[PDB]
Design a protein around this ligand. Sequence first.
Ligand SMILES: [Mn+2]
Ligand SMILES: [Mn+2]
Ligand SMILES: [Mn+2]
Length: 430
Amino acid sequence: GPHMATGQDRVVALVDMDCFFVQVEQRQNPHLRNKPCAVVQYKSWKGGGIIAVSYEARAFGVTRSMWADDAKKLCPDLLLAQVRESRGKANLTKYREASVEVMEIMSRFAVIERASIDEAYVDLTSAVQERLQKLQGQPISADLLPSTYIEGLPQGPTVQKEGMRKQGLFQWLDSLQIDNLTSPDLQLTVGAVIVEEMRAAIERETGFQCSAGISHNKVLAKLACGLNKPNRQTLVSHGSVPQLFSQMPIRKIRSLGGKLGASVIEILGIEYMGELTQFTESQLQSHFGEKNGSWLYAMCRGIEHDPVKPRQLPKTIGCSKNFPGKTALATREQVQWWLLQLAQELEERLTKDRNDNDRVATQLVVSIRVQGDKRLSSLRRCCALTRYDAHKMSHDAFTVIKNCNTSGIQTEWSPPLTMLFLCATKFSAS
DNA sequence: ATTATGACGCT
DNA sequence: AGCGTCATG
Ligand SMILES: [Mn+2]
Ligand SMILES: [Mn+2]
Ligand SMILES: [Mn+2]
């Protein structure tokens, strides 16, 4: 009806860098460009663990969370780049700095929400209004959308990928009412024009290619971004949602790839997101809780209200290291030495953060895992963070965790520690 | 031994 | 405050 709100108020984009860590290494080392390549952490155990994979390597079945030795079985010519190691641990500074490069360019076009090291949501609503009032009813040319897919098109009454892309785009642009400055489809289209410009600026000024999704909210923008990777962007209109969701596994929607999504599937006896529409809001709230139920009721209709938060910088700065198998920490000197290594990296990153961003952290969170505990964190404890001093930070973390040592001998540490994590939180403008 | 993080919800 | 969940470069 004329009041059933349709969640079409906003234009939201999700920009995701393609195989980011790989692109950072390929920019630095041209020998790795346009090759099957992957980025690995460490080397000794099974060749190191892969954390990023070029699309050429993905064609061979290489994935993240794969040991490099196994990846080399699938792709013997796979090229590898190793993450920096400093103070005995992986150091991701190069990739954080590259991320800042990209986030600063995105911020020129609109306010962004840093969702991860390599992805940000963009609220384009205002930028779209301004570009519309600049165009003054002039139609949008396909030339303004050279890497855009329109999800769901072409449809109705060439065998090449780009030919299909252009056919769908032409169907979309023909149907456009470029006279209605309040038409949601037109607003999304102008949003996509802007995202083409943003992605062009990112590639020109960093060398990095990215994909993007443009829709009316964050969940649809994220889903859209994944439909045509790499180096492409996808527009998911409100109208495309019924068909898109009719065959979309529930786990593909952000927030539903874990336990909650499995419970939606099992409790309701469904497989696809579109099947959620048959339940009342009260029914969904009865199985999944007030918040999740309302969210699911709206999401399966393409509607979600989560705002793009104005936040370009991480809320937390943390340092973590696992000590698996034999490498678990069994002496107090071991535990203190590694706490100091982590605290030294933390101090360096925190000092750079305070210089760059005019803020200081005030809470230190210390997390540990003990051997035999299946939970990723066995214990989390906070203390005050009043000085950027690695020695103080590490002594405080030790003070806060030392009561976990069940060993009657203070020299020994039982049960051995399989993970240490230091996290600076609660920033204040400084 | 699937590693180093980061965000957020729950109570 | 501490724990759990979800994401995944
Ligand atoms: Mn990415
Ligand atoms: Mn990403
Ligand atoms: Mn990924």
